[model samples]
Target chain A: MPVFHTRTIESILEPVAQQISHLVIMHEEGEVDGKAIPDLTAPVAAVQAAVSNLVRVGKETVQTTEDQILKRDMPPAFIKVENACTKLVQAAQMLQSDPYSVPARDYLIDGSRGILSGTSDLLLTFDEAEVRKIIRVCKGILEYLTVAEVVTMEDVTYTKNLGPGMTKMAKMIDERQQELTHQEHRVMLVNSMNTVKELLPVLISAMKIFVIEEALKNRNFTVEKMSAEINEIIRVLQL
Target chain B: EERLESIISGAALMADSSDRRERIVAECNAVRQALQDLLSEYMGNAGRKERSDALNSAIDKMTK
Candidate 1:
């Protein structure tokens, strides 16, 4: 029950194209005819009505978005669309009343183009927000894994936090992988997952003997290797 | 942008991690038990680093 019915900008913007085209073409045709519509009232009024609806819908769209960062980012884009629409309507009105003003016709086209491009910028902002969210998810999992360097078996196992934390990482990784459509990326996550799977025992077992000189070296290297593997996943995921 | 596809590796990794966490709890518990065993077998109940050191090495040797 989105007010716009879809979060997609294209779907929301789809209805307005006909309105923009309708208003734009009159002057476009008028250019060829070197003529003007005797009544500017009909088309200008229709354009005006569309602009009013757009503002109302725009307010609903920004308010309905649950993400605060995205919500904050949208207003500027929404306002730019409003301004572009206003400019186009003004140009259309000028072309009508003044009749055969080439400057006004050009200005009308510019404003229409602004609507499309401004909306595109808006969509780009939204996309960035989603990517930031994914990055945060991986960052948290990476931190959890990095604690393998803790080295003290008692500190981790005594509180039972390590098992619970690792389980959370496992589920989070699965969620991240399932949502990602890229096969290569999903495979990479599974590779890291398996690395962690095999290495946890090596980590815990070696730590059981961590006080000894030989086991100390091996334990640290395993932690380093584990860190590198997870870091690789995060590094590539950044791209 | 995401499509619903069967991610076999991702799903399997999830199960492996889930089961391994359980296995890990058991391993940790057994290591503590091994510490107790060392104290009992020889009554080497000494708090010396050497005793703990040998206990850990013994656990590692038997585990793998």
Candidate 2:
């Protein structure tokens, strides 16, 4: 039976922070304000598939053919696998609903709640629940991968214990699982950020790498610009 | 005759050798053949199990 560890909270929140920043920026810049919120109806589905892939990867990397021979194998390990699959499905379902879209604001009556008013005070008025939802979904993906890494490691150890001729196989599986676990942790940490302020530099760094320089870039956004945006968003919430 | 001893000696020699490639291949083939025979015999003996189970399930459901 494999022991389940409480996965790092940062792993889950970082991606959500990045996406929220991007989503807000896009919405504020008038890029997709009226455009049917491009059906991200797929992120949750993608997460579900990602979860399935994680389990499959775990099974392939560590699963021994001999285990099937036992009428009763490790029941606890099987339960953990099922739990991960179920959580991923639930998280995906939660994120698929269009939470960001709002009813049309009428200036004549609902003047205070109009789009202009909302935009002016955007980040300040953001729903914490929505932010938490993003964090939870991102966490689900990270935790799934993390568990896969652990399971693969356990599989290698078991194979090694079976004795000779499997030493090289054990070494290879161990190294591969370790590398995957580290990479998954990095992703999880970046997905869990709760504040856009904490997320901007990371986002800017990514943009500089992926969009501008076509290489790894970090901490390019000037502090002044970041601070000004944060203050402005804070001011809007005062309304 | 050297035939029986040759076969036994060959098995002994291979067993003593550290190389697992041939041993693995032979073991795999042996397992495959064993499993194939078992499956074939089981299928012959229990060919009606699926239909029987389905009919039983249907009768049970009707009773329910």
Candidate 3:
């Protein structure tokens, strides 16, 4: 039985909706306004509190419910998600305090009427290589969570957003498989390691966009600089 | 940071499982392939050269 911690996973995703909200608001207002933006700091900080509350709720519902997230029972994705969320919150907070910081560093182009520019944060550079890592991570988490249940593959389709830049990667993999004939070899380790290294920044970028989006939706800020960052982030990711 | 941690953890969890492990490995390769396929639709051989150049540059940087 692959152990799964529902609370941990949900806790990680909690900020995604909020981030989306921020992004939407930024999109609409054309600027970020702190007064109008929803503050995610409290909710993000409250993750531990929410876990504590879950414990209480579990106790109330059942006289004896083991801590779901015990060390052995915990999944690796738990830590990854936690780390990513921490970074997401930190990035959001920085943007919250000052949305222009990231944008200011990005390359820009001047148009006839105004200035046009885009930021190239870690997210923008995520290509097919990064998407594969994310997909792998997502699949791994799904394994623990779904165990024996039928799982929806809907989310997997989103991987389409990551590619079109390099197919040699695919052809190479296929050649290796055909050559190996289904044998598990240590050589795969090299590829695996490469994939993971490429995945980190891309994952962080995705989470960052999610939080920024949520901030925009809730009008968490008055200025739209963060939204601009998000727009560029999305374009790069999608491209 | 937290979310990054979670994803890493998630990847770690599946790292040990044979089926999941193989799937991830294959998936990564497939994604790369899919991307290459898409790229070929546009630039053909030119895309390959540019990709090789970029890859070589990255490797050179790392070794340096």
Per-model TM-score (chain A alone): 0.53, 0.22, 0.23
Tens-digit per-residue lDDT, A144-188, candidate 1: 445445545445442244454456556666665665545677789
- Per-residue lDDT of model 3, residues A1-239, tens digit only: 21111222222222333333444444365443333323434544443243333323323323332323222222332333234334534643654576444441111101100100010111111123343443343344333222212112433222322222113233333343333322333245234434533653454344344432463332323112232332332232222
Compose the digit string of candidate 3's lDDT tens values, residues B1-64. 2243244344433222233223333332332232223223212242123677699889999898
User: How would the candidate models be sorted by TM-score, starting from the highest?
Assistant: 1, 3, 2
Over the true interface residues, superposed, what is the Cα RMSD of model 3? 23.7
The lDDT values for all models are 0.53, 0.31, 0.32
A1-239 per-residue lDDT for model 2 (tens digits): 21111122223323333333443444356554443333332432443343344334334423543323221332333344344334433433333354334332111112211211222121111222223322333333222222221222323332222223222222322332333334443333323222433554454344334333334323233333433443333322122
lDDT per residue for candidate 1 within B1-64, as digits (tens), equals 0111112112212223313223322332332232223212211222234577788889999986
**Number of backbone collisions per candidate, in order?**
0, 12, 79
Best by TM-score: 1
> Which of candidates 2 and 3 reaches a greater DockQ?
3
Show the lowest summed lDDT stretch of 10 residues, model 1 chain A.
A1-10
Q: In model 3, which runs have C-alpha deviations exceeding 4 angstroms?
A: A1-39, A51-73, A99-239, B1-64
Worst 10 residues of 3 chain A by lDDT: A111-120
